[PDB]
Design a protein around this ligand. Structure first.
Ligand SMILES: [K+]
Ligand code: NA
Lengths: 138, 145
């Protein structure tokens, strides 16, 4: 059956991260948002939890990675069209994000990337509906 | 208006794996299906729900997506992927299965009563949680419980 997804990312400053993602147009769930965690809503079925580093450290026995030095994970969100890809990525860069990789452009697929305020690597990507193919058993 | 909610996006979490076939089989045992259109020898598209996916990408290929060296998830943690569970028994079945299939313990089980979760590191050291929360906690938030 479908499960909900919560992607937990450590951040130095919850308030700054919440403002960054708000600028990108994400809503937050107030019931799961406080000084140490902000619950970014991506859809009904997926959320990104922006967790203060000191709280995040309770969840792992390993030191917290420096995402400006190494990459363990990349979060990609879909976009509705090419203009959404550019608006989202340009907004991220203007809000303090930094360049990651060159745009990927196949004409009918278009993606951009950036590192967020804490170095976590994001992609935003559109694929043509004529191109975008279901779940099958392994 | 249902348009009070902003336009949703699909979510994909890209993770580097040493062996795509071994990773696909591991998550298949946990009950996940895969989308064939986006699955091949270099990348397996795990379907968590209609709107969330995990791309298990061969580690050599994953290097194309970042200018940084790839992390050793057995040494450091950058992210945790948590998936929901329908009830407490689902938490236990999922975590027990993961542990019996080559997963390793990450943290003790966390039982808050209104919320119950277990965690493990997968075959590549990425840290996962499976977690059930009561309807009351989902509406009210943990703070009020
Ligand atoms: K901090
Ligand atoms: Na720790």
């Amino acid at each position: 059956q479908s499960r909900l997804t919560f992607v937990n990312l450590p951040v130095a400053d919850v308030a700054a991260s919440q403002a960054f993602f708000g600028t990108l147009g994400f809503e937050f769930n107030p019931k799961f948002t406080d000084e140490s965690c902000a619950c970014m809503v991506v859809s009904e079925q997926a959320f990104v939890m922006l967790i203060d580093r000191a709280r995040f450290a309770d969840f792992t026995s390993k030191p917290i990675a420096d995402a400006t030095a190494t990459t363990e994970a990349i979060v990609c969100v879909s976009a509705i069209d090419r203009d959404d890809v550019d608006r989202f990525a340009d907004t991220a860069l203007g809000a303090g994000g930094t360049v990651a990789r060159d745009p990927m452009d196949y004409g009918f697929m278009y993606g951009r990337s950036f590192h967020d305020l804490d170095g976590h690597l994001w992609e935003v990507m559109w694929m043509s509906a004529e191109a975008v193919d279901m779940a099958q058993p392994v």
